[PDB]
């Protein structure tokens, strides 16, 4: 029979007032014989009605994928409201319910520290600029790098690691040509998190 999967909004979308956060109820294994699916939505037990169904998609394995999308307010998500999707279909002895929400717990402000390359890396063609982000809760975050207003895309970021005090830490490493580091260019670590002032902080780093 049909199965249900319910996904949160992207961190960025909940954090940027100019973006639109949405939760997504995905129903897989929908039969050709009974493709009609009914969605009910609840925000903290109270039903809402502004969900919209995305176009039906036929899958290579003879089933349909049906997806309902509920737009949410930023602050409802950040305040920790609970979102329930209830799915009904004829080929289903009983309706399936699924609930998701922000991680429970007091939010803690990330501490953001930029770290130049080791004197030992200076021999190499390319150098590592490190952004250490520690002491944040929950683990929902965005880390990006830039220089002179332009995104620097040659970075990688570790997944959040759970620390011994109950918060999370990660590190983000941007690899630049040594010559650009020598050239006095300023690089910036952009961190977005609910518990930061205005959801945003930026830390800069240049040849000392």
């Amino acid at each position: 029979g049909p199965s249900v999967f319910l996904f949160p909004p992207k961190p960025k979308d909940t954090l940027m007032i100019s973006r639109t956060p949405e939760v997504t109820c995905v129903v897989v294994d929908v039969s050709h014989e009974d493709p009609e699916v009914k969605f009910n939505w609840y925000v903290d037990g109270v039903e809402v009605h502004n969900a919209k169904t995305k176009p039906r998609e036929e899958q290579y394995n003879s089933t349909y994928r049906v997806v309902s999308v509920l737009t949410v307010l930023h602050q409802d998500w950040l305040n920790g409201k609970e979102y329930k999707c209830k799915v009904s279909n004829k080929a289903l002895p009983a309706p399936i319910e699924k609930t998701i929400s922000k991680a429970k717990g007091q939010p803690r402000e990330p501490q953001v520290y930029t770290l130049p390359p080791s004197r030992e890396e200076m021999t190499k063609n390319q150098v590592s600029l490190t952004c250490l982000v520690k002491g944040f809760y929950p683990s929902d975050i965005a880390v990006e790098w830039e220089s002179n207003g332009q995104p620097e895309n040659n970075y990688k970021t570790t997944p959040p690691v759970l620390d011994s005090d109950g918060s999370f830490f990660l590190a983000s490493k941007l690899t630049v040509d040594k010559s650009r580091w020598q050239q006095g260019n300023v690089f910036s670590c952009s961190v977005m998190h609910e518990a930061l002032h205005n959801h945003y902080t930026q830390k800069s780093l240049s040849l000392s």
Binding site: M16, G149, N198
Partner: peptide, 13 residues
């Protein structure tokens, strides 16, 4: 005061 990110508005208190 307001925070911006690559031109796009982040948040204002």
């Amino acid at each position: 005061d307001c925070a911006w990110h690559l031109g796009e508005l982040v948040w204002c208190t």
